[PDB]
Amino acid sequence: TEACVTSWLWSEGEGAVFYRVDLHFTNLGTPPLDEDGRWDPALMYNPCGPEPPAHVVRAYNQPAGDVRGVWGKGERTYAEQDFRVGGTRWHRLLRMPV
């Protein structure tokens, strides 16, 4: 059972990039578990692919904490995080709920 939400992300400087990210959320209900009751999905299931470039993925999946701006209006509002990853500055807009 499916849901989705969209992010945006872009870097600065020479060779700057700009991506849309559609996060497709799938509810797996109650999957099979081991003893104790632990799930090990990275090893159980096949990942999607082919992968985007390495540095783009590291940047999107970076922790960054400091919400530094709020974009958009009304019901479609986005939190901006602003961070560097090895000399490259990134901006990442995340949908923020109510």
Among 36, 51, 86, 87, binds its own copies (CB under 8 A): 51
How is residue 15 annotated by DSSP? T
Does 24 help bind its own copies (rule: CB under 8 A)? yes
Task: Put the strands of the sheet holding 88-95 in their side by side order.
Answer: 2-11, 88-95, 78-85, 67-71
3-state secondary structure of 57: helix
Does 28 help bind its own copies (rule: CB under 8 A)? yes
Shortest Å distance, C-beta 87 to its own copies? 16
3-state secondary structure of 45: coil
The token pair that represents 59 in the structure block:
């940047």
Q: Which of residues 72-91 bind its own copies (CB under 8 A)?
A: 72-74, 76, 78-79, 91
Does 34 help bind its own copies (rule: CB under 8 A)? no
The token pair that represents 71 in the structure block:
């974009």
- Per CB under 8 A, residues contacting its own copies are 3-8, 10-12, 16-32, 39-54, 56-58, 60-61, 63-65, 70-74, 76, 78-79, 91, 93-98
